[PDB]
Amino acid sequence: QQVKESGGRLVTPGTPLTLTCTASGFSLSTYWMSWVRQAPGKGLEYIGVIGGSGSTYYASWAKGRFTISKTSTTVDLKITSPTTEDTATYFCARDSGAGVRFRFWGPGTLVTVSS
Amino acid sequence: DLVMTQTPASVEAGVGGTVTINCQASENIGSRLAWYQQKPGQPPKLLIYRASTLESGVPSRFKGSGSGTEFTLTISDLECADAATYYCQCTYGVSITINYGNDFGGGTEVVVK
Amino acid sequence: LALENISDIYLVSNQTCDGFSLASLNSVISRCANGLNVVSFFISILKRSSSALTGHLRELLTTLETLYGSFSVEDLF
């Protein structure tokens, strides 16, 4: 069982970018996928979470700017307007239903935002 | 959302010693915490969840303790492969009634010498 | 059956017959009740009487509501 996220490219500041995260080897479907951020050389920053029922929640600073929306097999992030301070590495953290044991972490795709 | 004042910023010990990390939640989150361990160039690995229950795969050395508003991790007999950054996360963030957020910690390097 | 004769309720989610959608009531005899109808009842009786919870049962309000919000119903085919 493992989680891989994919899709992150250099953008003109202001072009919307979406990242996808694919759950490859899980059996039960009771999941809380979560996206966290890490600017190069800083601590981790929390972005949002999506359930199996669709119940999405966001952090206090990442409200309005980000959008997490699932599909049949992926979980999609959407940065609405990537500014220059939004260059980071974006992780995907999946677990079981209890919402406390964020056990499986993807390797990371490095979004960079600068013209 | 709440803040996690993870103290200190960088600790220091030797092989066969013990370190302590403190982080203090601003509201009574009640034994819902998690401790990660991010080496340089890696995704974070879970160590302890619900602030005292070891993730299946960690050594018996790591320990965690506390409830209410103050929690701690106490790695023991520091091996050579312990130089990494240690974060604490408040996992009270998926509900509709209480929902105290899900912010991480500030970061603590644990360097041996 | 009815909760005049209900003592224990188990919510095993990994090693049961099928998964979270089955939860065994018992009293001794055991039954096989509905999963998302006992969890979606105990949320509705702790959130309703939220003025009397001792501080340990608020952990029951948070565990049952997280466990219920993660079940994808569209994969119950």
CSV table of all heavy atoms in Angstrom, one decimal, chain A residues 32 34 36 46 49 57 93 95-103 105, chain B residues 1-2 4 23 25 27-36 46-53 68 71 87-95 98-105, chain C residues 59 62-63 66-67:
chain,number,residue,atom,x,y,z
A,32,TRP,N,-9.0,9.6,4.9
A,32,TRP,CA,-8.9,11.0,5.0
A,32,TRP,C,-7.6,11.4,4.4
A,32,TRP,O,-6.6,11.5,5.0
A,32,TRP,CB,-8.9,11.4,6.5
A,32,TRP,CG,-10.2,11.4,7.2
A,32,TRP,CD1,-10.6,10.5,8.2
A,32,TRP,CD2,-11.2,12.4,7.1
A,32,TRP,NE1,-11.8,10.8,8.6
A,32,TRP,CE2,-12.2,12.0,8.0
A,32,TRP,CE3,-11.4,13.5,6.4
A,32,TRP,CZ2,-13.4,12.7,8.2
A,32,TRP,CZ3,-12.6,14.3,6.5
A,32,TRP,CH2,-13.5,13.9,7.4
A,34,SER,N,-4.9,14.0,3.0
A,34,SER,CA,-4.6,15.4,3.5
A,34,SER,C,-3.3,15.9,2.7
A,34,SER,O,-2.5,15.1,2.4
A,34,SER,CB,-4.2,15.3,5.0
A,34,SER,OG,-3.4,16.4,5.3
A,36,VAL,N,-0.2,18.6,2.8
A,36,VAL,CA,0.6,19.5,3.5
A,36,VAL,C,1.7,20.1,2.6
A,36,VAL,O,2.0,19.6,1.5
A,36,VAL,CB,1.3,18.9,4.8
A,36,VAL,CG1,0.3,18.0,5.5
A,36,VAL,CG2,2.5,18.1,4.4
A,46,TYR,N,0.1,23.1,7.0
A,46,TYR,CA,-1.1,22.3,6.7
A,46,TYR,C,-2.0,23.0,5.8
A,46,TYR,O,-2.2,24.2,5.9
A,46,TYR,CB,-1.8,21.9,8.0
A,46,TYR,CG,-3.1,21.2,7.9
A,46,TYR,CD1,-3.1,19.8,7.6
A,46,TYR,CD2,-4.3,21.8,8.0
A,46,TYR,CE1,-4.3,19.1,7.5
A,46,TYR,CE2,-5.5,21.2,7.9
A,46,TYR,CZ,-5.5,19.8,7.6
A,46,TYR,OH,-6.7,19.2,7.5
A,49,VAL,N,-7.9,18.7,4.0
A,49,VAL,CA,-8.2,17.3,4.1
A,49,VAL,C,-9.5,17.0,3.4
A,49,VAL,O,-10.3,17.9,3.2
A,49,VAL,CB,-8.3,17.0,5.7
A,49,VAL,CG1,-9.4,17.8,6.3
A,49,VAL,CG2,-8.4,15.5,5.9
A,57,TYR,N,-12.2,20.0,4.6
A,57,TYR,CA,-11.9,21.0,5.6
A,57,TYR,C,-10.6,21.7,5.2
A,57,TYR,O,-9.8,21.0,4.6
A,57,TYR,CB,-11.9,20.5,7.0
A,57,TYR,CG,-13.1,19.7,7.4
A,57,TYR,CD1,-13.1,18.3,7.3
A,57,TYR,CD2,-14.2,20.3,7.9
A,57,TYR,CE1,-14.2,17.6,7.7
A,57,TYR,CE2,-15.3,19.6,8.3
A,57,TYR,CZ,-15.3,18.3,8.2
A,57,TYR,OH,-16.4,17.5,8.5
A,93,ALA,N,-1.1,12.7,2.4
A,93,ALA,CA,-1.1,11.9,3.6
A,93,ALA,C,-2.4,11.2,3.7
A,93,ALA,O,-3.4,11.9,4.0
A,93,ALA,CB,-0.7,12.7,4.8
A,95,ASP,N,-4.8,7.8,5.4
A,95,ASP,CA,-4.9,7.0,6.6
A,95,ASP,C,-6.1,6.2,6.6
A,95,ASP,O,-6.8,6.0,5.6
A,95,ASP,CB,-4.8,7.9,7.9
A,95,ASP,CG,-6.0,8.7,8.0
A,95,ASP,OD1,-6.5,9.2,7.0
A,95,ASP,OD2,-6.5,8.9,9.2
A,96,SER,N,-6.5,5.6,7.8
A,96,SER,CA,-7.8,4.9,7.9
A,96,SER,C,-8.8,5.9,8.4
A,96,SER,O,-8.6,7.1,8.3
A,96,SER,CB,-7.6,3.7,8.9
A,96,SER,OG,-7.6,4.2,10.2
A,97,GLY,N,-9.9,5.4,8.9
A,97,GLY,CA,-11.1,6.2,9.1
A,97,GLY,C,-11.0,7.1,10.3
A,97,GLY,O,-11.7,8.1,10.3
A,98,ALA,N,-10.2,6.8,11.3
A,98,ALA,CA,-10.3,7.4,12.6
A,98,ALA,C,-9.7,8.8,12.6
A,98,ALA,O,-9.9,9.6,13.6
A,98,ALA,CB,-9.5,6.6,13.7
A,99,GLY,N,-9.0,9.2,11.5
A,99,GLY,CA,-8.5,10.6,11.4
A,99,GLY,C,-7.4,11.0,12.3
A,99,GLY,O,-7.3,12.2,12.6
A,100,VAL,N,-6.6,10.1,12.8
A,100,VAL,CA,-5.5,10.4,13.7
A,100,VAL,C,-4.2,9.8,13.3
A,100,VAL,O,-3.2,10.3,13.8
A,100,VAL,CB,-6.0,9.9,15.1
A,100,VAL,CG1,-5.8,8.4,15.2
A,100,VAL,CG2,-5.2,10.6,16.2
A,101,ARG,N,-4.1,8.9,12.4
A,101,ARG,CA,-2.9,8.1,12.1
A,101,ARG,C,-2.4,8.3,10.7
A,101,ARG,O,-2.5,7.4,9.9
A,101,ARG,CB,-3.2,6.7,12.4
A,101,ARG,CG,-2.0,5.8,12.7
A,101,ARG,CD,-2.5,4.4,12.7
A,101,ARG,NE,-1.4,3.4,12.8
A,101,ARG,CZ,-1.6,2.1,12.8
A,101,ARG,NH1,-2.8,1.6,12.8
A,101,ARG,NH2,-0.6,1.3,12.9
A,102,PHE,N,-1.9,9.5,10.4
A,102,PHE,CA,-1.6,9.9,9.0
A,102,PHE,C,-0.3,9.2,8.5
A,102,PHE,O,0.8,9.7,8.4
A,102,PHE,CB,-1.4,11.4,8.8
A,102,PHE,CG,-2.8,12.1,8.7
A,102,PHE,CD1,-3.3,12.8,9.8
A,102,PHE,CD2,-3.5,12.1,7.6
A,102,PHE,CE1,-4.5,13.4,9.7
A,102,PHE,CE2,-4.7,12.7,7.5
A,102,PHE,CZ,-5.2,13.4,8.6
A,103,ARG,N,-0.5,7.9,8.1
A,103,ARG,CA,0.6,6.9,8.1
A,103,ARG,C,1.4,6.9,6.8
A,103,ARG,O,2.6,6.7,6.8
A,103,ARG,CB,0.1,5.6,8.4
A,103,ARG,CG,1.1,4.5,8.7
A,103,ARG,CD,0.4,3.2,9.0
A,103,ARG,NE,1.4,2.1,8.9
A,103,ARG,CZ,1.1,0.8,9.0
A,103,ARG,NH1,-0.2,0.5,9.2
A,103,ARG,NH2,2.0,-0.1,8.8
A,105,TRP,N,2.7,8.5,3.3
A,105,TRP,CA,3.1,9.8,2.8
A,105,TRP,C,3.8,9.6,1.4
A,105,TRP,O,4.6,8.8,1.2
A,105,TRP,CB,4.0,10.5,3.7
A,105,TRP,CG,3.4,11.0,4.9
A,105,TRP,CD1,2.9,10.2,6.0
A,105,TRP,CD2,3.1,12.3,5.3
A,105,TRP,NE1,2.4,11.0,7.0
A,105,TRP,CE2,2.5,12.3,6.6
A,105,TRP,CE3,3.4,13.6,4.7
A,105,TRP,CZ2,2.1,13.5,7.2
A,105,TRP,CZ3,3.0,14.7,5.3
A,105,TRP,CH2,2.4,14.7,6.6
B,1,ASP,N,-7.3,28.9,13.7
B,1,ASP,CA,-7.0,27.6,14.4
B,1,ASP,C,-6.0,27.8,15.5
B,1,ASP,O,-5.4,28.9,15.6
B,1,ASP,CB,-6.5,26.6,13.4
B,1,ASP,CG,-7.6,26.2,12.4
B,1,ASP,OD1,-8.6,25.6,12.8
B,1,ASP,OD2,-7.5,26.6,11.2
B,2,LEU,N,-5.7,26.8,16.3
B,2,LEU,CA,-4.8,26.9,17.4
B,2,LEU,C,-3.4,26.9,16.9
B,2,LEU,O,-3.1,26.6,15.8
B,2,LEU,CB,-5.0,25.8,18.4
B,2,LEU,CG,-5.1,24.3,18.0
B,2,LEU,CD1,-3.8,23.7,17.9
B,2,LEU,CD2,-6.0,23.6,18.9
B,4,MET,N,0.8,25.7,17.9
B,4,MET,CA,1.6,24.7,18.6
B,4,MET,C,3.0,25.3,18.9
B,4,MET,O,3.8,25.3,18.0
B,4,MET,CB,1.6,23.4,17.8
B,4,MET,CG,0.3,22.9,17.4
B,4,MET,SD,-0.5,22.1,18.7
B,4,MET,CE,0.8,21.0,19.2
B,23,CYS,N,5.6,20.6,23.2
B,23,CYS,CA,4.8,21.5,22.4
B,23,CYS,C,3.4,21.6,23.1
B,23,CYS,O,2.9,20.6,23.6
B,23,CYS,CB,4.6,21.1,21.0
B,23,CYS,SG,3.9,19.5,20.4
B,25,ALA,N,-0.4,22.9,23.1
B,25,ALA,CA,-1.6,23.3,22.4
B,25,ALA,C,-2.3,24.4,23.1
B,25,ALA,O,-2.3,24.5,24.3
B,25,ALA,CB,-2.5,22.1,22.2
B,27,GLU,N,-5.6,25.1,23.0
B,27,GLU,CA,-6.9,24.6,23.6
B,27,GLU,C,-6.7,23.2,24.1
B,27,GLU,O,-5.7,22.5,23.7
B,27,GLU,CB,-8.0,24.7,22.6
B,27,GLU,CG,-8.2,26.1,22.1
B,27,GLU,CD,-9.7,26.4,21.8
B,27,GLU,OE1,-10.5,26.2,22.7
B,27,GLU,OE2,-10.0,26.8,20.6
B,28,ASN,N,-7.6,22.7,24.9
B,28,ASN,CA,-7.6,21.4,25.5
B,28,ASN,C,-7.9,20.3,24.4
B,28,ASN,O,-9.0,19.9,24.3
B,28,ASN,CB,-8.5,21.2,26.7
B,28,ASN,CG,-8.1,21.9,27.9
B,28,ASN,OD1,-7.2,22.8,27.9
B,28,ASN,ND2,-8.7,21.5,29.0
B,29,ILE,N,-6.8,19.9,23.7
B,29,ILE,CA,-7.1,19.0,22.5
B,29,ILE,C,-7.3,17.6,23.0
B,29,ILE,O,-7.9,16.8,22.3
B,29,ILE,CB,-6.0,19.1,21.5
B,29,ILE,CG1,-4.6,18.7,22.1
B,29,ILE,CG2,-5.9,20.5,20.9
B,29,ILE,CD1,-3.5,18.7,21.1
B,30,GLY,N,-6.8,17.2,24.2
B,30,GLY,CA,-7.2,16.0,24.8
B,30,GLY,C,-6.6,14.7,24.1
B,30,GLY,O,-7.3,13.9,23.6
B,31,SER,N,-5.3,14.6,24.2
B,31,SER,CA,-4.5,13.4,23.8
B,31,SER,C,-4.7,13.0,22.4
B,31,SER,O,-4.6,11.8,22.0
B,31,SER,CB,-4.8,12.2,24.7
B,31,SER,OG,-6.2,11.9,24.9
B,32,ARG,N,-5.0,14.0,21.5
B,32,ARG,CA,-5.1,13.7,20.1
B,32,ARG,C,-3.9,14.5,19.5
B,32,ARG,O,-4.0,15.7,19.1
B,32,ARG,CB,-6.4,14.1,19.5
B,32,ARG,CG,-7.4,13.1,19.7
B,32,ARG,CD,-8.7,13.4,19.0
B,32,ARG,NE,-8.7,13.2,17.6
B,32,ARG,CZ,-9.6,12.4,17.0
B,32,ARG,NH1,-10.5,11.7,17.7
B,32,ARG,NH2,-9.5,12.2,15.7
B,33,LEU,N,-2.7,13.8,19.4
B,33,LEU,CA,-1.5,14.5,18.8
B,33,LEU,C,-0.8,13.4,18.0
B,33,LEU,O,-1.2,12.2,18.0
B,33,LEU,CB,-0.7,15.0,20.0
B,33,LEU,CG,0.4,16.0,19.7
B,33,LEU,CD1,-0.1,17.4,19.5
B,33,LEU,CD2,1.5,16.0,20.7
B,34,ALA,N,0.2,13.8,17.2
B,34,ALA,CA,1.0,12.9,16.5
B,34,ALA,C,2.4,13.5,16.3
B,34,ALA,O,2.5,14.7,16.2
B,34,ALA,CB,0.4,12.6,15.1
B,35,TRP,N,3.4,12.7,16.3
B,35,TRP,CA,4.8,13.1,16.2
B,35,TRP,C,5.4,12.5,15.0
B,35,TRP,O,5.4,11.2,14.8
B,35,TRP,CB,5.6,12.6,17.5
B,35,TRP,CG,5.2,13.3,18.7
B,35,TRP,CD1,4.2,13.0,19.6
B,35,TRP,CD2,5.8,14.5,19.2
B,35,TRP,NE1,4.2,13.9,20.6
B,35,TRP,CE2,5.1,14.8,20.4
B,35,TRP,CE3,6.8,15.3,18.8
B,35,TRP,CZ2,5.5,15.9,21.2
B,35,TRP,CZ3,7.1,16.4,19.6
B,35,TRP,CH2,6.5,16.7,20.7
B,36,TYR,N,6.0,13.3,14.1
B,36,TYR,CA,6.6,12.8,12.9
B,36,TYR,C,8.1,13.0,13.0
B,36,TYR,O,8.7,13.5,14.0
B,36,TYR,CB,6.1,13.6,11.7
B,36,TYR,CG,4.6,13.5,11.5
B,36,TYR,CD1,3.8,14.6,11.8
B,36,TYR,CD2,4.0,12.3,11.1
B,36,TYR,CE1,2.5,14.5,11.7
B,36,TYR,CE2,2.7,12.2,11.0
B,36,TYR,CZ,1.9,13.3,11.3
B,36,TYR,OH,0.6,13.2,11.1
B,46,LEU,N,5.6,8.7,10.4
B,46,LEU,CA,4.9,8.7,11.7
B,46,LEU,C,5.6,8.0,12.8
B,46,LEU,O,6.2,6.9,12.5
B,46,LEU,CB,3.5,8.2,11.5
B,46,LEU,CG,2.6,8.1,12.7
B,46,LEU,CD1,2.0,9.4,13.0
B,46,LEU,CD2,1.5,7.0,12.4
B,47,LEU,N,5.7,8.5,14.0
B,47,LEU,CA,6.3,7.8,15.1
B,47,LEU,C,5.2,7.4,16.2
B,47,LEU,O,5.1,6.3,16.5
B,47,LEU,CB,7.3,8.7,15.8
B,47,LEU,CG,8.6,9.0,15.0
B,47,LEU,CD1,9.5,9.8,15.9
B,47,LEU,CD2,9.2,7.7,14.6
B,48,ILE,N,4.5,8.4,16.7
B,48,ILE,CA,3.5,8.2,17.8
B,48,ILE,C,2.2,8.8,17.4
B,48,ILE,O,2.2,10.0,16.9
B,48,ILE,CB,4.0,8.8,19.1
B,48,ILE,CG1,5.4,8.3,19.5
B,48,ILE,CG2,3.1,8.4,20.2
B,48,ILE,CD1,6.0,9.0,20.7
B,49,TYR,N,1.1,8.1,17.6
B,49,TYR,CA,-0.2,8.7,17.3
B,49,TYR,C,-1.0,8.6,18.6
B,49,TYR,O,-0.8,7.7,19.4
B,49,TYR,CB,-0.9,8.1,16.1
B,49,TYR,CG,-1.3,6.7,16.2
B,49,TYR,CD1,-2.6,6.3,16.6
B,49,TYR,CD2,-0.4,5.7,16.0
B,49,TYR,CE1,-2.9,5.0,16.7
B,49,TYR,CE2,-0.7,4.4,16.1
B,49,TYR,CZ,-2.0,4.0,16.4
B,49,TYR,OH,-2.3,2.7,16.5
B,50,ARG,N,-2.0,9.5,18.8
B,50,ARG,CA,-2.8,9.7,20.0
B,50,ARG,C,-1.9,10.0,21.2
B,50,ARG,O,-2.3,9.6,22.3
B,50,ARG,CB,-3.7,8.6,20.3
B,50,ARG,CG,-4.8,8.3,19.2
B,50,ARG,CD,-6.1,8.5,19.7
B,50,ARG,NE,-7.1,8.0,18.8
B,50,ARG,CZ,-8.4,7.9,19.0
B,50,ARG,NH1,-8.9,8.4,20.2
B,50,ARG,NH2,-9.3,7.5,18.1
B,51,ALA,N,-0.7,10.5,21.0
B,51,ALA,CA,0.2,11.1,21.9
B,51,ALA,C,0.9,10.1,22.9
B,51,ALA,O,1.8,10.4,23.6
B,51,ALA,CB,-0.4,12.2,22.8
B,52,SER,N,0.5,8.8,22.8
B,52,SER,CA,1.2,7.8,23.6
B,52,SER,C,1.3,6.4,22.9
B,52,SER,O,1.8,5.5,23.6
B,52,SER,CB,0.6,7.6,25.0
B,52,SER,OG,1.0,6.4,25.6
B,53,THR,N,0.8,6.2,21.7
B,53,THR,CA,0.7,4.9,21.1
B,53,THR,C,1.6,4.8,19.9
B,53,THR,O,1.4,5.5,19.0
B,53,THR,CB,-0.8,4.6,20.6
B,53,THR,OG1,-1.7,4.7,21.8
B,53,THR,CG2,-0.8,3.2,20.1
B,68,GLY,N,-4.4,16.9,27.6
B,68,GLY,CA,-4.8,18.2,27.9
B,68,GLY,C,-4.0,19.1,27.1
B,68,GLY,O,-4.0,19.0,25.9
B,71,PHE,N,2.2,18.3,25.9
B,71,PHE,CA,2.7,17.0,25.5
B,71,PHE,C,4.2,16.9,25.3
B,71,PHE,O,4.8,17.9,25.2
B,71,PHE,CB,2.0,16.6,24.2
B,71,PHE,CG,0.5,16.7,24.1
B,71,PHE,CD1,0.0,17.9,23.9
B,71,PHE,CD2,-0.2,15.6,24.3
B,71,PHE,CE1,-1.4,18.0,23.8
B,71,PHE,CE2,-1.6,15.7,24.2
B,71,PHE,CZ,-2.2,16.9,24.0
B,87,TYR,N,8.5,17.0,14.2
B,87,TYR,CA,7.3,17.9,14.3
B,87,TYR,C,6.3,17.2,15.1
B,87,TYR,O,6.2,16.0,15.2
B,87,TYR,CB,6.8,18.1,12.8
B,87,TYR,CG,7.8,18.8,11.9
B,87,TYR,CD1,8.5,18.1,11.0
B,87,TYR,CD2,7.9,20.1,12.0
B,87,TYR,CE1,9.4,18.7,10.2
B,87,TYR,CE2,8.8,20.8,11.2
B,87,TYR,CZ,9.5,20.1,10.3
B,87,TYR,OH,10.4,20.7,9.5
B,88,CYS,N,5.4,18.0,15.7
B,88,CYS,CA,4.2,17.6,16.4
B,88,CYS,C,3.0,18.2,15.8
B,88,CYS,O,3.0,19.4,15.5
B,88,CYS,CB,4.3,17.9,17.9
B,88,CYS,SG,4.3,19.6,18.4
B,89,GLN,N,2.0,17.3,15.5
B,89,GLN,CA,0.8,17.7,14.8
B,89,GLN,C,-0.4,17.5,15.7
B,89,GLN,O,-0.5,16.4,16.3
B,89,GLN,CB,0.6,16.9,13.5
B,89,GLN,CG,-0.6,17.3,12.7
B,89,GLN,CD,-0.8,16.3,11.5
B,89,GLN,OE1,-0.7,15.1,11.7
B,89,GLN,NE2,-1.1,16.9,10.4
B,90,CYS,N,-1.3,18.4,15.8
B,90,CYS,CA,-2.6,18.3,16.5
B,90,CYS,C,-3.6,17.7,15.6
B,90,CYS,O,-4.1,18.4,14.7
B,90,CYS,CB,-3.0,19.6,17.1
B,90,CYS,SG,-4.7,19.6,17.6
B,91,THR,N,-4.0,16.5,15.7
B,91,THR,CA,-4.9,15.8,14.8
B,91,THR,C,-6.3,15.9,15.1
B,91,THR,O,-7.1,15.1,14.7
B,91,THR,CB,-4.5,14.3,14.7
B,91,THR,OG1,-4.2,13.8,16.0
B,91,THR,CG2,-3.3,14.1,13.9
B,92,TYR,N,-6.7,17.0,15.8
B,92,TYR,CA,-8.1,17.3,16.1
B,92,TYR,C,-8.8,18.1,14.9
B,92,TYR,O,-9.3,19.2,15.2
B,92,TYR,CB,-8.2,18.1,17.4
B,92,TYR,CG,-9.4,17.8,18.2
B,92,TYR,CD1,-9.2,17.0,19.4
B,92,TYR,CD2,-10.7,18.1,17.9
B,92,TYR,CE1,-10.3,16.7,20.1
B,92,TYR,CE2,-11.7,17.8,18.6
B,92,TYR,CZ,-11.5,17.1,19.8
B,92,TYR,OH,-12.6,16.7,20.6
B,93,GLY,N,-8.7,17.6,13.7
B,93,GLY,CA,-9.1,18.5,12.6
B,93,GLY,C,-10.1,18.0,11.7
B,93,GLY,O,-10.4,18.6,10.6
B,94,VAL,N,-10.7,16.8,12.0
B,94,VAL,CA,-11.7,16.2,11.1
B,94,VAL,C,-13.0,15.9,11.9
B,94,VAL,O,-13.1,14.8,12.5
B,94,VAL,CB,-11.2,15.0,10.3
B,94,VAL,CG1,-10.4,15.5,9.2
B,94,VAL,CG2,-10.2,14.3,11.2
B,95,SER,N,-13.9,16.9,12.0
B,95,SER,CA,-15.2,16.8,12.7
B,95,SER,C,-16.0,17.9,12.3
B,95,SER,O,-15.5,18.8,11.5
B,95,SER,CB,-15.0,16.8,14.2
B,95,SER,OG,-14.0,16.0,14.7
B,98,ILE,N,-16.4,20.0,17.2
B,98,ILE,CA,-15.4,20.7,17.9
B,98,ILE,C,-14.4,21.3,16.8
B,98,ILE,O,-14.3,22.5,16.7
B,98,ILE,CB,-14.7,19.9,18.9
B,98,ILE,CG1,-15.7,19.0,19.6
B,98,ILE,CG2,-13.9,20.7,19.9
B,98,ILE,CD1,-16.5,19.7,20.6
B,99,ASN,N,-13.6,20.4,16.2
B,99,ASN,CA,-12.8,20.8,15.0
B,99,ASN,C,-11.7,21.9,15.3
B,99,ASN,O,-11.8,23.0,14.8
B,99,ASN,CB,-13.6,21.2,13.8
B,99,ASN,CG,-12.9,21.1,12.5
B,99,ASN,OD1,-11.8,20.5,12.4
B,99,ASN,ND2,-13.4,21.8,11.5
B,100,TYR,N,-10.8,21.5,16.2
B,100,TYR,CA,-9.7,22.4,16.6
B,100,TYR,C,-8.6,22.6,15.6
B,100,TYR,O,-7.5,23.0,16.1
B,100,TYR,CB,-9.2,22.0,17.9
B,100,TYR,CG,-10.0,22.3,19.1
B,100,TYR,CD1,-10.0,21.6,20.3
B,100,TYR,CD2,-10.8,23.5,19.1
B,100,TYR,CE1,-10.8,21.9,21.4
B,100,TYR,CE2,-11.6,23.8,20.2
B,100,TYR,CZ,-11.5,23.0,21.3
B,100,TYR,OH,-12.3,23.3,22.4
B,101,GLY,N,-8.8,22.3,14.3
B,101,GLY,CA,-7.7,22.5,13.4
B,101,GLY,C,-6.7,21.4,13.4
B,101,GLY,O,-6.8,20.4,14.1
B,102,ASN,N,-5.7,21.6,12.5
B,102,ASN,CA,-4.7,20.5,12.2
B,102,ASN,C,-3.3,21.0,12.0
B,102,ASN,O,-2.6,20.4,11.1
B,102,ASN,CB,-5.2,19.6,11.1
B,102,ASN,CG,-4.9,18.2,11.2
B,102,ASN,OD1,-3.8,17.8,11.6
B,102,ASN,ND2,-5.8,17.3,10.9
B,103,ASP,N,-2.9,22.1,12.7
B,103,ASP,CA,-1.6,22.7,12.4
B,103,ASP,C,-0.5,21.9,12.9
B,103,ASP,O,-0.6,21.2,13.9
B,103,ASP,CB,-1.6,24.1,12.9
B,103,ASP,CG,-2.4,25.1,12.1
B,103,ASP,OD1,-3.3,24.6,11.4
B,103,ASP,OD2,-2.2,26.3,12.2
B,104,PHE,N,0.7,22.0,12.2
B,104,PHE,CA,1.9,21.3,12.6
B,104,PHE,C,2.6,22.1,13.7
B,104,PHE,O,2.1,23.0,14.3
B,104,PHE,CB,2.8,21.1,11.4
B,104,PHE,CG,2.5,19.9,10.6
B,104,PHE,CD1,1.6,19.9,9.6
B,104,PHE,CD2,3.1,18.7,11.0
B,104,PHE,CE1,1.4,18.8,8.9
B,104,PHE,CE2,2.9,17.6,10.3
B,104,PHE,CZ,2.0,17.6,9.2
B,105,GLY,N,3.9,21.7,14.0
B,105,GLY,CA,4.7,22.3,14.9
B,105,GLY,C,5.7,23.3,14.2
B,105,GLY,O,5.6,23.5,13.0
C,59,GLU,N,-14.9,12.8,23.5
C,59,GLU,CA,-14.0,11.9,22.7
C,59,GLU,C,-14.8,10.9,21.9
C,59,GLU,O,-14.4,10.5,20.8
C,59,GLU,CB,-12.9,11.3,23.5
C,59,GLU,CG,-11.7,10.7,22.8
C,59,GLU,CD,-11.0,11.8,21.9
C,59,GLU,OE1,-11.0,13.0,22.3
C,59,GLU,OE2,-10.5,11.3,20.9
C,62,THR,N,-16.2,12.8,19.0
C,62,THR,CA,-15.3,13.1,18.0
C,62,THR,C,-14.8,11.9,17.2
C,62,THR,O,-14.4,12.0,16.0
C,62,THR,CB,-14.1,13.8,18.6
C,62,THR,OG1,-14.6,14.8,19.5
C,62,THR,CG2,-13.3,14.6,17.6
C,63,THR,N,-14.7,10.7,17.9
C,63,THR,CA,-14.3,9.5,17.2
C,63,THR,C,-15.4,9.0,16.2
C,63,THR,O,-15.1,8.6,15.1
C,63,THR,CB,-13.9,8.4,18.2
C,63,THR,OG1,-13.0,9.0,19.1
C,63,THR,CG2,-13.3,7.3,17.5
C,66,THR,N,-15.8,11.4,13.2
C,66,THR,CA,-14.7,11.2,12.2
C,66,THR,C,-14.8,9.9,11.5
C,66,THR,O,-14.6,9.9,10.2
C,66,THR,CB,-13.4,11.3,12.9
C,66,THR,OG1,-13.3,12.6,13.6
C,66,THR,CG2,-12.2,11.2,12.0
C,67,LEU,N,-15.1,8.8,12.2
C,67,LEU,CA,-15.3,7.5,11.5
C,67,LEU,C,-16.5,7.5,10.6
C,67,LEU,O,-16.4,6.7,9.7
C,67,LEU,CB,-15.4,6.5,12.6
C,67,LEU,CG,-15.3,5.0,12.3
C,67,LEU,CD1,-14.0,4.8,11.5
C,67,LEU,CD2,-15.3,4.2,13.5
